[PDB]
């Protein structure tokens, strides 16, 4: 069906070619051995071929290859009708988006002025909502779509140094020692969580619970709905800088060079991972491996079940600020201005992002997917790299004040857009968010 409809209605008729003469099914079994790039050329051969190559189940699978899962349903009328395949257009859409990030003209970004003369300390990007956190004591909910400020969460009496968001629920951690739970739509504080005595430095939200790390050397697990404190994890002698929570175990990294694995329900420390010869600053956890980055220059990969160190990843030369772990592929941003990609299964350093177009200073943040790695730096640039080859592609953002104070503190990316928190310590750059759009016209 659908392919038959086309044949009856269009009536191509009379083809002296091998595939036009084959029974429909076998022609399709043949075209299935081709790759999207081929199918697209084949489709420009003739009307018979175009109708065939435009199957649908053929593309539904080619999409299940690039991990698409969702077909695209466009709308509206030329004559000789054509029954376009939603899966096929979904594929082309993505192909165009990738190309757009890669070499498509850079459309000037929406500028979102805010947090004047202050720092944007934490960033969240969920759907069409952007949430900026600042040491100016506030947070601002924005529309990635219009670039307008929807709300300003005023309430904290200290600077905000951490946040988390899960559609309409925002959480904040301030120097005032409390977390606050907000309603992103109405912008009203729903809870104020007391218990920490020192700065709420880091937090990780999982479903209805959020775990907070503080300078007071402890962590607390809170219920987002009933603003209560379910558990207190005490055992760290120095400040807790980073934390991860998957709902089962809580993993924490502290200035005491230690990484601790916990079972929150019974407030017990199941493991104390020892190895880092200096402050632990970054953490990633996938339910199986714990990964920690230290001021000691190394990155350790641990088995969460046994507490055993599986790999000690060496090569960076300074502080690893951020790391992202997906499918056992790790990407680390470092103050040494370098970025590395690792296979945490084998320990191999797959790529080091550097070269003539490398960062001129510390890497402040990064994002990646199956194709690219996006990196930001104090050099005022946000760069795009090829994950598979480790090669530099282009500078997505290049602050003119880059070499004299302009800085990109952090970034967040979705499939179609990039949100950059930008500013400076010396006023050469007004603090703002830059929103770049890579969506395609379809």
């Amino acid at each position: 069906t659908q392919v038959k409809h086309m044949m009856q209605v269009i009536e191509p008729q009379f083809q002296r070619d091998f595939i036009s003469l084959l029974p429909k099914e076998l022609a399709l079994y043949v075209l299935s051995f081709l790759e999207p790039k081929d199918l697209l050329q084949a489709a420009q051969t003739c009307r018979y071929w175009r109708i065939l190559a435009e199957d649908n189940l053929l593309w539904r699978e080619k999409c299940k290859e690039e991990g698409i899962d969702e077909p695209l349903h466009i709308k509206r009328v030329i004559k000789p009708g054509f029954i376009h395949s939603p899966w096929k257009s979904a594929y082309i859409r993505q192909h165009r988006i990738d190309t757009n990030w890669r070499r498509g003209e850079l459309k000037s970004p929406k500028v979102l002025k805010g947090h004047d003369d202050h720092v944007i300390t934490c960033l969240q990007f969920c759907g069409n909502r952007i949430v900026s956190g600042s040491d100016d004591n506030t947070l601002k909910v924005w529309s990635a779509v219009t670039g307008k400020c929807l709300r300003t969460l005023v309430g904290h009496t200290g600077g905000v140094w951490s946040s988390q968001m899960r559609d309409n629920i925002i959480i904040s951690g301030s120097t005032d020692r409390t977390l606050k739970v907000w309603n992103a739509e109405t912008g009203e504080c729903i809870h104020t969580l007391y218990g920490h005595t020192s700065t709420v430095r880091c937090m990780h939200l999982h479903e209805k619970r959020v775990v907070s790390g503080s300078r007071d050397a402890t962590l607390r697990v809170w219920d987002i709905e009933t603003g209560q404190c379910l558990h207190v994890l005490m055992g760290h002698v120095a400040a807790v800088r980073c934390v991860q929570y998957d709902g089962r175990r809580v993993v924490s990294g502290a200035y005491d060079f230690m990484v601790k694995v916990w079972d929150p329900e019974t407030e017990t420390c199941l493991h104390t991972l020892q190895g880092h010869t200096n402050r632990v600053y970054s953490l990633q956890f996938d339910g199986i491996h714990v990964v920690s980055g230290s001021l000691d220059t190394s990155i350790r990969v641990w088995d969460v079940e046994t507490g055993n160190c599986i790999h000690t990843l060496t090569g960076h030369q300074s502080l690893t600020s951020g790391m992202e772990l997906k499918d056992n592929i790790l990407v680390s941003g470092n103050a040494d201005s370098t970025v590395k990609i690792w296979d945490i299964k084998t320990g191999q350093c797959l790529q080091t992002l550097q070269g003539p177009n490398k960062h001129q200073s510390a890497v402040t943040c990064l994002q990646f997917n199956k194709n690219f790695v996006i990196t930001s730096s104090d050099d005022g640039t946000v760069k795009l790299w090829d994950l598979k080859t480790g090669e530099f592609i282009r500078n997505l953002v290049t602050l003119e004040s880059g070499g004299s104070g302009g800085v990109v503190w952090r970034i967040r990316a979705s499939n179609t857009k990039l949100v950059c928190a930008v500013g400076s310590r010396n006023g050469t750059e007004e603090t703002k968010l830059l929103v770049l759009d890579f969506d395609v016209d379809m």
């Binding site: 720092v119 300390t121 040491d135 600077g159 140094w161 120097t175 700065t199 430095r201 300078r215 001021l295 300074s318 502080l319 600020s321 103050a335 510390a362 402040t364 503190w409």
Partner: peptide
């Protein structure tokens, strides 16, 4: 190491 943190 002048990547953000709050003082005391």
């Amino acid at each position: 190491s002048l990547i953000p943190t709050p003082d005391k």
